[PDB]
Design an enzyme around this catalytic site. Structure first.
Site, short mmCIF file in Angstrom:
data_model
loop_
_atom_site.label_atom_id
_atom_site.label_comp_id
_atom_site.label_asym_id
_atom_site.label_seq_id
_atom_site.Cartn_x
_atom_site.Cartn_y
_atom_site.Cartn_z
N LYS A 1 0.80 -1.22 0.00
CA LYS A 1 0.00 0.00 0.00
C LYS A 1 0.84 1.27 0.00
CE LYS A 1 -2.24 -1.20 3.77
NZ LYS A 1 -1.21 -2.26 4.07
N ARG B 1 -7.96 2.35 10.32
CA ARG B 1 -7.61 0.98 10.70
C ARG B 1 -8.65 0.33 11.61
NH1 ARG B 1 -2.08 1.25 9.44
NH2 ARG B 1 -1.34 -0.79 10.15
N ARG C 1 11.54 -6.47 4.15
CA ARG C 1 11.47 -5.02 3.98
C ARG C 1 12.66 -4.32 4.64
NH1 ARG C 1 5.99 -1.86 5.37
NH2 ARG C 1 6.38 -2.63 7.50
N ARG D 1 13.03 -2.40 10.19
CA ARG D 1 12.14 -1.91 11.24
C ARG D 1 11.98 -2.95 12.34
NH1 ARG D 1 6.78 0.45 8.05
NH2 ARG D 1 5.83 -0.52 9.90
N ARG E 1 0.81 -8.07 14.34
CA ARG E 1 0.23 -7.08 13.43
C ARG E 1 -0.84 -7.71 12.54
NH1 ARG E 1 5.34 -5.42 10.56
NH2 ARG E 1 4.06 -4.02 9.27
N1 LIG Z 1 -4.58 4.42 11.45
C1 LIG Z 1 -3.82 3.93 12.45
N2 LIG Z 1 -4.36 3.67 13.67
C2 LIG Z 1 -3.62 3.19 14.69
N3 LIG Z 1 -2.31 2.90 14.59
C3 LIG Z 1 -1.65 3.11 13.42
C4 LIG Z 1 -2.38 3.64 12.25
N4 LIG Z 1 -1.49 3.74 11.25
C5 LIG Z 1 -0.28 3.29 11.73
N5 LIG Z 1 -0.40 2.90 13.02
C6 LIG Z 1 0.67 2.38 13.91
O1 LIG Z 1 1.90 2.32 13.19
C7 LIG Z 1 2.27 0.98 12.93
C8 LIG Z 1 2.86 0.90 11.52
O2 LIG Z 1 1.81 1.28 10.63
P1 LIG Z 1 2.00 1.28 9.04
O3 LIG Z 1 3.36 1.84 8.74
O4 LIG Z 1 0.76 1.92 8.48
O5 LIG Z 1 2.00 -0.32 8.94
P2 LIG Z 1 2.73 -1.22 7.83
O6 LIG Z 1 3.82 -1.92 8.61
O7 LIG Z 1 1.61 -2.12 7.38
O8 LIG Z 1 3.28 -0.28 6.80
C9 LIG Z 1 0.98 0.20 13.10
O9 LIG Z 1 1.23 -1.17 13.41
C10 LIG Z 1 0.33 0.95 14.26
O10 LIG Z 1 1.01 0.71 15.50
N1 LIG Z 2 3.95 -5.74 -5.69
C1 LIG Z 2 5.03 -6.06 -4.96
N2 LIG Z 2 5.80 -7.14 -5.24
C2 LIG Z 2 6.89 -7.46 -4.50
N3 LIG Z 2 7.28 -6.75 -3.43
C3 LIG Z 2 6.59 -5.64 -3.05
C4 LIG Z 2 5.40 -5.23 -3.80
N4 LIG Z 2 4.92 -4.11 -3.22
C5 LIG Z 2 5.73 -3.83 -2.17
N5 LIG Z 2 6.73 -4.73 -2.09
C6 LIG Z 2 7.76 -4.80 -1.05
O1 LIG Z 2 7.07 -5.44 0.03
C7 LIG Z 2 7.26 -4.73 1.26
C8 LIG Z 2 5.93 -4.15 1.78
O2 LIG Z 2 5.59 -3.01 0.98
P1 LIG Z 2 4.92 -1.71 1.62
O3 LIG Z 2 4.57 -0.77 0.49
O4 LIG Z 2 5.82 -1.22 2.75
O5 LIG Z 2 3.56 -2.37 2.22
P2 LIG Z 2 2.40 -1.74 3.18
O6 LIG Z 2 2.49 -0.23 3.08
O7 LIG Z 2 1.16 -2.34 2.58
O8 LIG Z 2 2.73 -2.33 4.55
C9 LIG Z 2 8.31 -3.67 0.97
O9 LIG Z 2 9.56 -4.27 1.33
C10 LIG Z 2 8.22 -3.45 -0.53
O10 LIG Z 2 9.46 -3.07 -1.15
#
Ligand SMILES: Nc1ncnc2c1ncn2[C@@H]1O[C@H](COP(=O)(O)OP(=O)(O)O)[C@@H](O)[C@H]1O
Ligand SMILES: Nc1ncnc2c1ncn2[C@@H]1O[C@H](COP(=O)(O)OP(=O)(O)O)[C@@H](O)[C@H]1O
Length: 203
Positions: free
Chosen positions: A13, A85, A124, A150, A161
């Site tokens: 995303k 969320r 990642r 991370r 998560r």
């Molecule tokens: N809309 C939200 N509501 C509550 N917590 C959030 C939200 N967006 C992000 N977080 C917090 O930040 C963490 C990382 O979120 P995000 O970066 O959006 O997740 P991802 O690892 O799927 O990219 C989440 O697990 C949560 O702790």
């Molecule tokens: N379509 C895809 N195919 C393979 N790897 C991907 C794709 N989209 C994202 N990634 C990789 O997968 C991981 C999760 O992507 P990310 O955009 O951070 O997800 P989200 O925001 O949904 O948590 C990152 O390491 C990214 O580089």
């Protein structure tokens, strides 16, 4: 136009939102990015949010809802990336937008199976200087470039998560489907293919 990107962590995303923002001029609102900056800056929000995030739990609704009011732009198309969320968050967004004469136009649901989630998150990596996101297999950092993993992308936190996603966030699928604005994205495909589907969906 107001878009919401919804789906399991690791679905891609963030990656798609950054691209769409960069190429089409949307305002990208990443609650994760904003919170990480808050944690880094040591703000009242950052200090309170830090532990929830490190543990893989959602930050409490009141803090996030405030955050969203603080950063929602006066003009521009918006991508909500990782917000809402929870149902309470989604209801607060509807309210906030309604007061502005706006509404969510599309909710893109980025579908991936658990196997792919784990594979995407465990691989990642982030460039700490630029914020650029890589993947050790699918999009590796250039040779010599220093990247970090991370703390919440460690195996047991990914597990938490995903449970939290299934428990608190997945109900949003039905929430938005009823409104007739849910668009399915096959997020298991390669990045370029996913982006083409994102573009088709939003017209
Ligand atoms: N809309 C939200 N509501 C509550 N917590 C959030 C939200 N967006 C992000 N977080 C917090 O930040 C963490 C990382 O979120 P995000 O970066 O959006 O997740 P991802 O690892 O799927 O990219 C989440 O697990 C949560 O702790
Ligand atoms: N379509 C895809 N195919 C393979 N790897 C991907 C794709 N989209 C994202 N990634 C990789 O997968 C991981 C999760 O992507 P990310 O955009 O951070 O997800 P989200 O925001 O949904 O948590 C990152 O390491 C990214 O580089």
């Amino acid at each position: 136009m107001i878009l919401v990107f919804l789906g399991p962590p690791g679905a891609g995303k963030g990656t798609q939102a950054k691209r769409l923002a960069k190429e089409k001029g949307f305002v990208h609102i990443s609650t994760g990015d904003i919170l990480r900056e808050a944690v880094q800056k040591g703000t009242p929000l950052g200090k309170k949010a830090k532990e929830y995030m490190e543990r893989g739990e959602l930050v409490p609704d009141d803090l996030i809802i405030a955050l969203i009011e603080e950063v929602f732009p006066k003009h521009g198309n918006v991508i909500f990336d990782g917000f809402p969320r929870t149902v309470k968050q989604a209801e607060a967004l509807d309210e906030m937008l309604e007061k502005k004469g706006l509404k969510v136009d599309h909710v893109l649901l980025f579908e991936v199976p658990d196997e792919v989630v784990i594979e995407r998150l465990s691989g990642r990596r982030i460039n700490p200087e630029t914020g650029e996101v890589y993947h050790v297999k699918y999009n590796p950092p250039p040779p010599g470039v220093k990247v970090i993993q991370r703390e919440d992308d460690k195996p047991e936190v990914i597990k938490k998560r995903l449970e939290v996603y299934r428990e608190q966030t997945a109900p949003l699928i039905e929430y938005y489907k009823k409104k007739g604005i849910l668009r399915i994205i096959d997020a298991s495909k390669p990045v370029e293919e996913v982006y083409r589907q994102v573009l088709e969906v939003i017209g």
